[PDB]
Write a protein that binds this DNA or RNA. Structure first.
Ligand SMILES: [Mg+2]
Ligand SMILES: [Mg+2]
Ligand SMILES: [Mg+2]
Ligand SMILES: [Mg+2]
Ligand SMILES: [Mg+2]
Ligand SMILES: [Mg+2]
Ligand SMILES: [Mg+2]
Ligand SMILES: [Mg+2]
Ligand SMILES: [Mg+2]
Ligand SMILES: [Mg+2]
Ligand SMILES: [Mg+2]
Ligand SMILES: [Mg+2]
Ligand SMILES: [Mg+2]
Ligand SMILES: [Mg+2]
Ligand SMILES: [Mg+2]
Ligand SMILES: [Mg+2]
Ligand SMILES: [Mg+2]
Ligand SMILES: [Mg+2]
Ligand SMILES: [Mg+2]
Ligand SMILES: [Mg+2]
Ligand SMILES: [Mg+2]
Ligand SMILES: [Mg+2]
Ligand SMILES: [Mg+2]
Ligand SMILES: [Mg+2]
Ligand SMILES: [Mg+2]
Ligand SMILES: [Mg+2]
Ligand SMILES: [Mg+2]
Ligand SMILES: [Mg+2]
Ligand SMILES: [Mg+2]
Ligand SMILES: [Mg+2]
Ligand SMILES: [Mg+2]
Ligand SMILES: [Mg+2]
Ligand SMILES: [Mg+2]
Ligand SMILES: [Mg+2]
Ligand SMILES: [Mg+2]
Ligand SMILES: [Mg+2]
Ligand SMILES: [Mg+2]
Ligand SMILES: [Mg+2]
Ligand SMILES: [Mg+2]
Ligand SMILES: [Mg+2]
Ligand SMILES: [Mg+2]
Ligand SMILES: [Mg+2]
Ligand SMILES: [Mg+2]
Ligand SMILES: [Mg+2]
Ligand SMILES: [Mg+2]
Ligand SMILES: [Mg+2]
Ligand SMILES: [Mg+2]
Ligand SMILES: [Mg+2]
Ligand SMILES: [Mg+2]
Ligand SMILES: [Mg+2]
Ligand SMILES: [Mg+2]
Ligand SMILES: [Mg+2]
Ligand SMILES: [Mg+2]
Ligand SMILES: [Mg+2]
Ligand SMILES: [Mg+2]
Ligand SMILES: [Mg+2]
Ligand SMILES: [Mg+2]
Ligand SMILES: [Mg+2]
Ligand SMILES: [Mg+2]
Ligand SMILES: [Mg+2]
Ligand SMILES: [Mg+2]
Ligand SMILES: [Mg+2]
Ligand SMILES: [Mg+2]
Ligand SMILES: [Mg+2]
Ligand SMILES: [Mg+2]
Ligand SMILES: [Mg+2]
Ligand SMILES: [Mg+2]
Ligand SMILES: [Mg+2]
Ligand SMILES: [Mg+2]
Ligand SMILES: [Mg+2]
Ligand SMILES: [Mg+2]
Ligand SMILES: [Mg+2]
Ligand SMILES: [Mg+2]
Ligand SMILES: [Mg+2]
Ligand SMILES: [Mg+2]
Ligand SMILES: [Mg+2]
Ligand SMILES: [Mg+2]
Ligand SMILES: [Mg+2]
Ligand SMILES: [Mg+2]
Ligand SMILES: [Mg+2]
Ligand SMILES: [Mg+2]
Ligand SMILES: [Mg+2]
Ligand SMILES: [Mg+2]
Ligand SMILES: [Mg+2]
Ligand SMILES: [Mg+2]
Ligand SMILES: [Mg+2]
Ligand SMILES: [Mg+2]
Ligand SMILES: [Mg+2]
Ligand SMILES: [Mg+2]
Ligand SMILES: [Mg+2]
Ligand SMILES: [Mg+2]
Ligand SMILES: [Mg+2]
Ligand SMILES: [Mg+2]
Ligand SMILES: [Mg+2]
Ligand SMILES: [Mg+2]
Ligand SMILES: [Mg+2]
Ligand SMILES: [Mg+2]
Ligand SMILES: [Mg+2]
Ligand SMILES: [Mg+2]
Ligand SMILES: [Mg+2]
Ligand SMILES: [Mg+2]
Ligand SMILES: [Mg+2]
Ligand SMILES: [Mg+2]
Ligand SMILES: [Mg+2]
Ligand SMILES: [Mg+2]
Ligand SMILES: [Mg+2]
Ligand SMILES: [Mg+2]
Ligand SMILES: [Mg+2]
Ligand SMILES: [Mg+2]
Ligand SMILES: [Mg+2]
Ligand SMILES: [Mg+2]
Ligand SMILES: [Mg+2]
Ligand SMILES: [Mg+2]
Ligand SMILES: [Mg+2]
Ligand SMILES: [Mg+2]
Ligand SMILES: [Mg+2]
Ligand SMILES: [Mg+2]
Ligand SMILES: [Mg+2]
Ligand SMILES: [Mg+2]
Ligand SMILES: [Mg+2]
Ligand SMILES: [Mg+2]
Ligand SMILES: [Mg+2]
Ligand SMILES: [Mg+2]
Ligand SMILES: [Mg+2]
Ligand SMILES: [Mg+2]
Ligand SMILES: [Mg+2]
Ligand SMILES: [Mg+2]
Ligand SMILES: [Mg+2]
Ligand SMILES: [Mg+2]
Ligand SMILES: [Mg+2]
Ligand SMILES: [Mg+2]
Ligand SMILES: [Mg+2]
Ligand SMILES: [Mg+2]
Ligand SMILES: [Mg+2]
Ligand SMILES: [Mg+2]
Ligand SMILES: [Mg+2]
Ligand SMILES: [Mg+2]
Ligand SMILES: [Mg+2]
Ligand SMILES: [Mg+2]
Ligand SMILES: [Mg+2]
Ligand SMILES: [Mg+2]
Ligand SMILES: [Mg+2]
Ligand SMILES: [Mg+2]
Ligand SMILES: [Mg+2]
Ligand SMILES: [Mg+2]
Ligand SMILES: [Mg+2]
Ligand SMILES: [Mg+2]
Ligand SMILES: [Mg+2]
Ligand SMILES: [Mg+2]
Ligand SMILES: [Mg+2]
Ligand SMILES: [Mg+2]
Ligand SMILES: [Mg+2]
Ligand SMILES: [Mg+2]
Ligand SMILES: [Mg+2]
Ligand SMILES: [Mg+2]
Ligand SMILES: [Mg+2]
Ligand SMILES: [Mg+2]
Ligand SMILES: [Mg+2]
Ligand SMILES: [Mg+2]
Ligand SMILES: [Mg+2]
Ligand SMILES: [Zn+2]
Lengths: 181, 110, 53, 84, 141
RNA sequence: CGCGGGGUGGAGCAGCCUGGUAGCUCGUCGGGCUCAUAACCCGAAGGUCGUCGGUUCAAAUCCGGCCCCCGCAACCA
RNA sequence: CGCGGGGUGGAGCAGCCUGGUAGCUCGUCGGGCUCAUAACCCGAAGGUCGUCGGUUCAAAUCCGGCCCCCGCAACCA
RNA sequence: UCCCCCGUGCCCAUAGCGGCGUGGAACCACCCGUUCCCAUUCCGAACACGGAAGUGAAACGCGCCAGCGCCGAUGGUACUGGGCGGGCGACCGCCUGGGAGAGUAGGUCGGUGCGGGGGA
RNA sequence: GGUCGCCUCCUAAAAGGUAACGGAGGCGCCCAAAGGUCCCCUCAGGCGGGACGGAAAUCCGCCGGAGAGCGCAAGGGUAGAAGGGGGCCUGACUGCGAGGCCUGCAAGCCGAGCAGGGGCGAAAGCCGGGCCUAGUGAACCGGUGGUCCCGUGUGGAAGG
RNA sequence: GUAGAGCACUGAUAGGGCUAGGGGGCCCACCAGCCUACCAAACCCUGUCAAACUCCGAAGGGUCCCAGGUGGAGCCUGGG
């Protein structure tokens, strides 16, 4: 479909290591990335400016996909929040577009962050998936300083077929996910 | 618990069953497509046409059209002409559509 | 009804007869009501518009 | 003498009776149009030759004989078998 | 003083007291119990009164069980006023007891001690009563 | 027993009708003037709205019960 | 239903008859004087002149519609 | 006319949850691809189309086991239509017919219809 | 003093109905989408993981039959949709109406089907407002728009 | 959909277990270890309660068909 870097490392290096490590019988048993979802939980743009599209153009830039809106489920008073208010962005990366984002993340994003000292090991799902948080977003290379108004974080979730954290730990560690402890 | 698959099925099937007409049901596997005609009063298939049984092949849509046409042949012979189309969990489009389009000019009233 | 949910007639633009009577919210939908409706006089359909009750 | 500081009653009302229920039973002969069940929600569901009105009223669509059916989890149904 | 913490409804219709007790007819906790012989609305005042009497009797010792609870609101119209103009007010809570219902139980106190204590208790209750010992029949239930 | 009103910073009153936001005067505390006190000037703190429930995204505000205060009523014999 | 006249800055407001100026008082800001307080005095921010369409070189000023507040009188089976 | 599979009804958990095992010849499914039809408030996930390299890992089909869930007698009793009796009274009791709920024994890892494809 | 019509629940004794100044609550509105249809989607809640971010904003995972939602009180109903999103639309039709529910009258209620001219749908089909049950007022008197039926010898006009 | 009965729903409920949080003391505090004959949500076991609770549920009651029933029965129209 498209020859890419990280997909090669998975298929030509990560795969076999996993097999010899847990002794998978069948081929599809071998754990693999299903999808990567980015979610900028804004709501800072609630009643406020529709200039969440600045964060949206910034988003589509990083991912190469157009981001969708997320709106208020229930209204909450303590949050100054009306049910239906636009309060976030979410974009779902699958197949090749996933592989590209992950390559630029493990290689260029994650190092360029202030005082990187490893990903949290305990942050594993319990049924094979993994979650992390960024606060910057100029951290991605295609975002120069001039494009930014104010900072903005995002919620990355990465989903694998791994039955458990162990298998998941390995699939990620082997790809290039640097862990802290 | 229910898949959206099953929910769609019931939802479109039940509506048709209420109109009391004969029912042209359809199955659309990855490799074939099948279409039987059912009297839900008695719970019985009156006539059936399929790709596997036709020993047919040559692009899914163009194939699908024929099984419809073939279905009409055996149907009209028996007396069946009036019928309702169970489009199953499948969007009325492409392959399923072609089956309908064929079965239409094949003589079926629907 | 109320001062705000008001009553009104629908008048056929073709032949000016009022053939239907209904309501609307004045605040919510403040424009005159445009609607196709059957005319028994013209014996076809017709764009009818709102008319003060 | 007697009639001292008594009281009052903050409630004390009700609505009119609505005469709901099954109106024709299993085995009863019926004309098309006959009301079969007055109800709130589908406590019964329309079956063969039975239609349902906007307030959930069940009526016969054909002359025939009324027939009931409990299909367990699928609910209860009123039918009308036509007559030859 | 027993009474519900919260209540779905504040006033409750009176009802009859048909039949024997619905259940709670076998000893379930201690060795001896007090059984109702005739039915009644047992006031929350009476429950408490019996309770205290036993407690007091064997000062510090044993454990008292109470198998009845006043959840029925008891109504009373004011003095010297006439019929009508609404239902009276809630003025206390009773527990509906019926013959066969074990109402109290005691344990971990000597047989003689239990007998007197349960006996005094019954004297507080508005009905005829009997003491009973835990049976093979009770443990079977 | 009945009917109407009320309870909000230490005192005395607004805000409730129309739900989102707590005001006024006094007092108080800190700093000025004065030899000193007051008057006077500058600056500040202080309530989680009688009490339980309920409605609501949200309650001093809307709804039910209870408690305390206030006014009216309580006649024919 | 039928009449009469208003909307102009944060509050009230003559400018409208007679088309060339968004002006006045009070309000807030800064400065002068002050035992201080006011009052006095100098300056200053603050408006699409209800809307939309229209005659006009130009109109809050004049027209048509429409919104809204007040006002006048009558009717209410 | 026995076996396996596919579509589809009926009985509506004795059919379900969970566990363990089995199945790719065929069917079916995941699967391969995004040119075309169609599609995503983002994503070929879904829907859709063109395919057949791989795999039964998932899903599904078929088994097996009774932890769960579900079903659940007989016997007895509550209550009761009708007919009576005792007690000042509170309430009890009798005949006749009907007869639960709970619980006990125990059952269950479905049964069947019509069509299609493939077998021995 | 309280109440007076309508709706929901109990009282109501397993059909319907049933009283009291018996026990609890609601209504006198609302929506041009909260309506018609076609297509798609499925809750609440719990646990785990996740920058700002909390009990609760938005994202991921597993569980979950309905305890959510259905404008509003309650009941019944309901995910095999009546709920959530979208596309196109005005059937929130006109002329009728076999047959019944309810019922003292007068009211109230459900309704297939026929014709006209439409809507959405490939189609079967659905559509004569809204998940349903409250959201209301006989007749008399008058207003407004139609029609062109009567109109005092005739044609107009007044008035019906 | 009652009598009875039941707790699966809406609430109530005594004891015990388990266990968020809350309180007293300790360590003494900055965060954490607290251990607790106290208070206690959720949950589990024993044991119960309810007109406006029901996983259940009779006896009866209602209506329809067939049969008996000829009675100061019954049905239709009208006068009092
Ligand atoms: Mg590619
Ligand atoms: Mg490899
Ligand atoms: Mg925010
Ligand atoms: Mg389920
Ligand atoms: Mg679906
Ligand atoms: Mg559906
Ligand atoms: Mg059948
Ligand atoms: Mg060929
Ligand atoms: Mg052709
Ligand atoms: Mg034909
Ligand atoms: Mg035209
Ligand atoms: Mg208007
Ligand atoms: Mg027209
Ligand atoms: Mg007297
Ligand atoms: Mg009095
Ligand atoms: Mg009062
Ligand atoms: Mg009622
Ligand atoms: Mg009535
Ligand atoms: Mg009544
Ligand atoms: Mg219908
Ligand atoms: Mg009905
Ligand atoms: Mg039957
Ligand atoms: Mg059945
Ligand atoms: Mg069911
Ligand atoms: Mg069903
Ligand atoms: Mg159902
Ligand atoms: Mg308590
Ligand atoms: Mg009694
Ligand atoms: Mg009994
Ligand atoms: Mg008895
Ligand atoms: Mg007895
Ligand atoms: Mg009892
Ligand atoms: Mg002792
Ligand atoms: Mg005694
Ligand atoms: Mg004994
Ligand atoms: Mg013994
Ligand atoms: Mg035991
Ligand atoms: Mg007053
Ligand atoms: Mg008043
Ligand atoms: Mg007052
Ligand atoms: Mg008062
Ligand atoms: Mg008060
Ligand atoms: Mg106050
Ligand atoms: Mg005070
Ligand atoms: Mg005052
Ligand atoms: Mg008040
Ligand atoms: Mg007020
Ligand atoms: Mg001082
Ligand atoms: Mg001084
Ligand atoms: Mg509150
Ligand atoms: Mg407030
Ligand atoms: Mg409150
Ligand atoms: Mg208050
Ligand atoms: Mg209060
Ligand atoms: Mg006098
Ligand atoms: Mg006198
Ligand atoms: Mg003035
Ligand atoms: Mg054989
Ligand atoms: Mg089968
Ligand atoms: Mg069966
Ligand atoms: Mg099942
Ligand atoms: Mg297991
Ligand atoms: Mg096992
Ligand atoms: Mg094994
Ligand atoms: Mg095995
Ligand atoms: Mg094996
Ligand atoms: Mg093969
Ligand atoms: Mg190609
Ligand atoms: Mg292309
Ligand atoms: Mg193209
Ligand atoms: Mg299209
Ligand atoms: Mg397209
Ligand atoms: Mg959007
Ligand atoms: Mg779009
Ligand atoms: Mg399996
Ligand atoms: Mg086992
Ligand atoms: Mg078992
Ligand atoms: Mg069952
Ligand atoms: Mg038995
Ligand atoms: Mg027996
Ligand atoms: Mg008997
Ligand atoms: Mg009897
Ligand atoms: Mg007797
Ligand atoms: Mg006697
Ligand atoms: Mg006796
Ligand atoms: Mg006898
Ligand atoms: Mg006898
Ligand atoms: Mg018997
Ligand atoms: Mg008997
Ligand atoms: Mg077995
Ligand atoms: Mg099983
Ligand atoms: Mg099994
Ligand atoms: Mg078997
Ligand atoms: Mg057979
Ligand atoms: Mg009065
Ligand atoms: Mg009854
Ligand atoms: Mg609206
Ligand atoms: Mg769709
Ligand atoms: Mg959708
Ligand atoms: Mg959730
Ligand atoms: Mg969480
Ligand atoms: Mg969160
Ligand atoms: Mg913050
Ligand atoms: Mg989410
Ligand atoms: Mg529930
Ligand atoms: Mg909710
Ligand atoms: Mg539901
Ligand atoms: Mg519900
Ligand atoms: Mg279902
Ligand atoms: Mg829908
Ligand atoms: Mg939705
Ligand atoms: Mg939704
Ligand atoms: Mg919707
Ligand atoms: Mg919408
Ligand atoms: Mg729509
Ligand atoms: Mg279209
Ligand atoms: Mg209308
Ligand atoms: Mg006829
Ligand atoms: Mg006729
Ligand atoms: Mg009538
Ligand atoms: Mg009505
Ligand atoms: Mg049509
Ligand atoms: Mg379609
Ligand atoms: Mg068409
Ligand atoms: Mg409609
Ligand atoms: Mg509605
Ligand atoms: Mg409505
Ligand atoms: Mg009325
Ligand atoms: Mg009159
Ligand atoms: Mg008139
Ligand atoms: Mg008239
Ligand atoms: Mg004439
Ligand atoms: Mg004339
Ligand atoms: Mg004349
Ligand atoms: Mg004339
Ligand atoms: Mg006229
Ligand atoms: Mg029931
Ligand atoms: Mg009922
Ligand atoms: Mg339940
Ligand atoms: Mg309930
Ligand atoms: Mg509950
Ligand atoms: Mg509880
Ligand atoms: Mg407890
Ligand atoms: Mg405990
Ligand atoms: Mg503590
Ligand atoms: Mg301490
Ligand atoms: Mg400390
Ligand atoms: Mg320290
Ligand atoms: Mg600490
Ligand atoms: Mg600290
Ligand atoms: Mg410190
Ligand atoms: Mg410890
Ligand atoms: Mg009841
Ligand atoms: Mg009951
Ligand atoms: Mg049963
Ligand atoms: Mg059962
Ligand atoms: Mg039953
Ligand atoms: Mg039985
Ligand atoms: Mg029966
Ligand atoms: Mg006979
Ligand atoms: Zn017309």
């Amino acid at each position: 479909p498209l020859d890419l870097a990280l997909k090669r490392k998975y298929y030509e290096e990560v795969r076999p290591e996993l097999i010899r490590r847990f002794g998978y019988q069948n081929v599809w048993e071998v754990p693999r990335l299903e999808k990567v979802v980015i979610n900028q939980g804004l709501g800072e743009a609630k009643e406020d400016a529709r200039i969440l599209e600045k964060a949206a153009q910034e988003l589509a830039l990083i991912t190469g996909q157009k981001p969708a809106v997320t709106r208020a489920k229930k209204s909450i008073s303590n949050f100054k929040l009306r049910k239906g208010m636009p309060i976030g962005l979410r974009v779902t990366l699958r197949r090749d577009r996933m592989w590209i984002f992950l390559e630029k993340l493990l290689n260029v994003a994650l190092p360029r962050i202030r005082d990187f000292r490893g990903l949290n090991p305990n942050s594993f799902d319990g049924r094979g998936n993994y979650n992390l948080g960024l606060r910057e977003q100029l951290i991605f290379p295609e975002i120069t300083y001039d494009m930014v108004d104010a900072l903005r974080g995002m919620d990355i979730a990465v989903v694998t077929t791994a039955e458990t954290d162990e298998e998941a730990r390995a699939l990620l560690e082997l790809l290039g996910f640097p862990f802290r402890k | 618990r229910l898949t959206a698959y099953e929910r769609r099925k019931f939802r479109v099937r039940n509506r048709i069953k209420r109109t009391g007409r004969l029912r042209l049901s359809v199955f659309r596997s990855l490799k074939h497509i099948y279409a039987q005609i059912i009297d839900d009063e008695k719970g019985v298939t009156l006539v059936s046409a399929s790709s596997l049984a036709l020993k047919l092949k040559g692009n899914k849509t163009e194939v699908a059209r024929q099984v419809g046409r073939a279905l009409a042949e055996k149907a009209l012979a028996l007396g069946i002409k009036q019928v309702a189309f169970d489009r199953g969990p499948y969007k009325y489009h492409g392959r399923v559509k072609a089956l309908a389009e064929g079965a239409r000019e094949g003589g079926l009233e629907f | 009804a109320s001062e705000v949910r008001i009553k009104l007639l629908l008048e056929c633009t073709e032949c000016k007869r009022r053939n239907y009577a209904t309501e609307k919210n004045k605040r919510n939908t403040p424009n005159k009501l445009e609607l196709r409706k059957y005319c028994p006089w013209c014996r076809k359909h017709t764009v009818h518009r709102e008319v003060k009750i | 003498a007697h009639k001292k500081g008594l009281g009052s009653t903050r409630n004390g009302r009700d609505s009119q009776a609505k005469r709901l229920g099954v109106k024709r039973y299993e085995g009863q002969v019926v004309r098309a149009g006959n009301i079969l069940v007055r109800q709130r929600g589908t406590r019964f569901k329309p079956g063969k030759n039975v239609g349902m009105g906007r307030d959930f009223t069940l009526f016969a669509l054909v002359d025939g004989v009324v027939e009931f059916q409990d299909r367990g989890r699928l609910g209860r149904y009123v039918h009308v078998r036509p007559l030859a | 003083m027993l009474m519900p913490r919260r209540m779905k409804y504040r006033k409750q219709q009176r009802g009859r007291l048909k039949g024997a007790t619905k259940g709670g007819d076998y000893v379930a906790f201690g060795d001896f119990g007090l059984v109702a012989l005739e039915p009644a609305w047992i006031t929350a005042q009476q429950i408490e009164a019996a309770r205290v009497a036993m407690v007091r009797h064997f000062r510090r010792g044993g454990k008292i069980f109470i198998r009845i609870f006043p959840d029925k609101p008891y109504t009373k119209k004011p003095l010297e006023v006439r019929m009508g103009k609404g239902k009276g007010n809630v003025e206390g809570y009773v527990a509906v007891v019926k013959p066969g219902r074990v109402m109290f139980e005691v344990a971990g106190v000597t047989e003689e001690q239990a007998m007197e204590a349960l006996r005094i208790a019954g004297h507080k209750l508005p009905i005829k009563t009997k003491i009973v010992r835990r049976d093979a029949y009770d443990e079977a239930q």
